[PDB]
UniProtKB/Swiss-Prot annotation, chains A, B:
Detected in forebrain. Detected in dendrites of neuronal cells. Expressed in the pyramidal cell layers of CA1 and CA3 and in the granule cell layer of the dentate gyrus. The chain holds residues 414 to 794 of 883 of the full protein. GO terms for molecular function: AMPA glutamate receptor activity; amyloid-beta binding; cytoskeletal protein binding; extracellular ligand-gated monoatomic ion channel activity; extracellularly glutamate-gated ion channel activity; glutamate receptor binding; glutamate-gated calcium ion channel activity; glutamate-gated receptor activity. This is Glutamate receptor 2. The gene is Gria2. The postsynaptic actions of L-glutamate are mediated by a variety of receptors that are named according to their selective agonists. This receptor binds AMPA (quisqualate) > L-glutamate > kainate.
């Protein structure tokens, strides 16, 4: 049986190639997770089909219906066999799906236009002249919603009732908002993404301060999957071979344009 | 039944309290892992007994005899029920015991005596006046032994044949060797340990260069253990609640001497 891989279009993890119109199947995509999927498939010895998650979300549970959406949902409901993407390993998700050991370590970070008078999370929480927000349906937003840390909770009370919404639907929208806000909007996002964008022209953003937390991205499989065990060992093997470090260089700095 | 916890005497993870002779049981020890053990036990709801691994090793399989030593061996042979220590998550170990998601992220790093003209692994590899080695019997030594990367293999070729041995029995031994080397010996060890020592008197060592790799420490249990699932969720919950960050600040910087 061909393994159905659910993923998400998020640069530089998964992106359509420039000449995709003349390509088919998995050949239409390129990126860190596309190379990773190939590596895993080869090691676990299976054929696969990359599919972009329907609703374009990572995964959250509807408070009222208790229904899971995003990639997590595709696994939970059996629409996908494995998820290979920048999916954060979290307690609530671990309760419903399986995660391999992390293939990438990261943390929440701050993205500023450039020249913006902000160097830390505290700086943001001290003023209101500069707005800030996060992605939606993600682990970053939830981080602030649940944080008991004085500063982070103070940052959440603002973001929650912020008018208009400081939250964005996709990373691209957040980065776009930062760039066109004359430095009046700071974006909170996962460090790996921050670092990638900082190397992308117009080269007008920069990551500031240390990460607010420490987390990891993991490959996910549904509970009781015959793939989980093998995939977990594959990730460890790949990290130990240095392949994972090889891949980040390739997609983050070898292609940097700043 | 009371859970038997195996751990190792490695500062600041586990250390005998100054007046341990006056105390009994678990109260005899203090440290990052002692604090972590208490929390994991509370959240998982079990009583435990801390025990220092008999042979003072982390865990390796002897080729030929096929016997596992160290903390890994105690889990494999059923002498301990869980290992709470700076035990590196590795593929070979993952094949015989279970690991929770990492509670700490780190990488191999370089420790020099302040003033040593070394800034990278490449630097070490391209010279010979300054000797260098690693802890013996651990994941750091194995990283070099198994590495297929040019720089690191070149480093391993030197270390494995150096005489007298550049390997050390304990971290304290490696650090003391660096301190009395007059800059003629550099020590390769895990980043978190390097960072800790850099904050201890006489304040004569320093971490240089970026980490050579990326990995993490995890709580280990025997395969098929009844505690596995709960311990894993506890680690994720404790990280998400910020405890892990609080603990590292407590044992690394709050008590810094430099
Ligand atoms: Zn490979
Ligand atoms: Zn709803
Ligand atoms: Zn607690």
């Amino acid at each position: 049986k061909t393994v159905v891989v659910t993923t998400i279009l998020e640069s530089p993890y998964v992106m359509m190639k420039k000449n995709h119109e003349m390509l088919e199947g998995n050949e239409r995509y390129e990126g860190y997770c596309v190379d990773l999927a190939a590596e895993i498939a080869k090691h676990c010895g299976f054929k696969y089909k990359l599919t972009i998650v329907g609703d374009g979300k990572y995964g959250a549970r509807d408070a009222d219906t208790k229904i899971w959406n995003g990639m997590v949902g595709e696994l939970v409901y059996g629409k996908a066999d494995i998820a290979i993407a920048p999916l954060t390993i979290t307690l609530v998700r671990e309760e419903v799906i399986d995660f391999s050991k992390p293939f990438m370590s990261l943390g929440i970070s701050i993205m500023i236009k450039k020249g913006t008078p902000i160097e830390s999370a505290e700086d943001l929480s001290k003023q209101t002249e500069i707005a800030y927000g996060t992605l939606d349906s993600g682990s970053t937003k939830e981080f602030f919603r649940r944080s008991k840390i004085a500063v982070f909770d103070k940052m959440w009370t603002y973001m929650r009732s912020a008018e208009p919404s400081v939250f964005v639907r996709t990373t691209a929208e957040g980065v776009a908002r930062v760039r066109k806000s004359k430095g009046k909007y700071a974006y909170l996002l996962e460090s790996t993404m921050n670092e990638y964008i900082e190397q992308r022209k117009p080269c007008d953003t920069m990551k500031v301060g240390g990460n607010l937390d420490s987390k990891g991205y993991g490959i996910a499989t549904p509970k009781g999957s015959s793939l989980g065990n093998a995939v977990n060992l594959a990730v460890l093997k790949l990290n130990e071979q240095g392949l994972l470090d090889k891949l980040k260089n390739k997609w983050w700095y070898d292609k940097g344009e700043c």
